[PDB]
Design an enzyme around this catalytic site. Structure first.
Site, PDB file in Angstrom:
ATOM      1  CG  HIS A   2     113.726  -1.313  37.369  1.00  0.00           C
ATOM      2  ND1 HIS A   2     114.973  -1.295  36.786  1.00  0.00           N
ATOM      3  CD2 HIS A   2     112.835  -1.263  36.349  1.00  0.00           C
ATOM      4  CE1 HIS A   2     114.845  -1.233  35.472  1.00  0.00           C
ATOM      5  NE2 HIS A   2     113.558  -1.213  35.181  1.00  0.00           N
TER       6      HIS A   2
ATOM      7  CG  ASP B 136     117.780  -2.028  38.523  1.00  0.00           C
ATOM      8  OD1 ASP B 136     117.334  -1.169  37.731  1.00  0.00           O
ATOM      9  OD2 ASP B 136     117.051  -2.881  39.077  1.00  0.00           O
TER      10      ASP B 136
ATOM     11  CB  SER C 271     114.332  -2.527  32.268  1.00  0.00           C
ATOM     12  OG  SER C 271     114.620  -1.198  31.881  1.00  0.00           O
TER      13      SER C 271
END
Ligand SMILES: *[C@@H]1O[C@H](CO)[C@@H](O)[C@H](O)[C@H]1NC(C)=O
Length: 234
Positions: free
Chosen positions: A43, A88, A180
């Site tokens: 992402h 992810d 992230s």
């Protein structure tokens, strides 16, 4: 990262910051696997990714900082969900290799699986408070907890999924917006890739999700090896 402090300047040589040709904002981080590859979260992908290696302070440039752009991006194609968020993870091949130095070095992949109870470390340039970003990367220690804590909280994280639920059940320490894609380090090895948690971060009883790197070792090695038909673990 909330609940932590500025990282030691030598403890994150594999940590890279991700931004774009349009914004200098660090929207994610990543981990250097070797001279030409970076592992991060899927992402974290953007149209024109830019990668800063060898950085600590955003205002005081390390002498060996390097800037790179992708030449190739690889994802898992066998995901339970169409947006691919249940797996992810993404590999970025740098257009040109980097040379190792004090502030630019590869992280080691996990040699064995680690679970509940394991003490690990998180790091990044993400928010350190509700609406504040640091000028240097912050670090802190958290623990891998029972996967059941994350499941009811994150729809993209099914049971038996290849992820580690980690943080501080009491709250106070956790990854946050901007963190992230970064690495979760346990005993000197990268066992996870920051997938995400809750907003605001650091809430009581709300640990975050980290893609379990060990499960993807074969896929990662294969991709780097030149294989372009190998698939991610089921
Ligand atoms: C890619 O890996 C797959 C699974 O290992 C295997 O069929 C083969 O080793 C690789 N393909 C190529 C072209 O090397």
């Amino acid at each position: 990262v909330v609940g932590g402090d500025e990282c030691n300047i030598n403890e994150h040589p594999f940590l890279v910051a991700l931004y774009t040709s349009a914004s200098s904002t660090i929207h994610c981080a990543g981990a250097l696997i070797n001279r030409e590859w970076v592992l991060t979260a899927a992402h974290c992908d953007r149209r024109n990714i830019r990668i800063k290696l060898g950085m600590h302070s955003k205002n005081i440039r390390n002498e060996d900082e390097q800037i790179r752009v992708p030449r190739g991006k690889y994802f898992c194609l066998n995901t339970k969900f169409p947006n691919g968020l249940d797996k992810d993870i993404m590999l970025i091949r740098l257009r040109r290799p980097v040379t190792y130095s004090t502030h630019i070095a590869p992280v080691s992949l996990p040699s064995r699986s680690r679970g509940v109870g394991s003490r690990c470390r998180i790091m990044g340039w993400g928010k350190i408070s509700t609406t504040t970003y640091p000028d240097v990367p912050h670090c802190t220690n958290i623990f891998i907890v029972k996967h059941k804590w994350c499941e009811p909280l994150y729809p993209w994280v099914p049971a038996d999924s290849r992820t580690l639920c980690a943080g501080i059940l009491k709250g106070g320490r956790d990854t946050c917006h901007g963190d992230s894609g970064g690495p979760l380090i346990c005993n000197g090895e990268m066992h996870g890739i920051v997938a995400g948690g809750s907003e605001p971060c650091g809430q009581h009883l709300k640990p975050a999700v980290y893609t379990k790197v060990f499960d993807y070792n074969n896929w990662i090695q294969s991709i780097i090896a030149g294989n372009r038909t190998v698939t991610c673990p089921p």
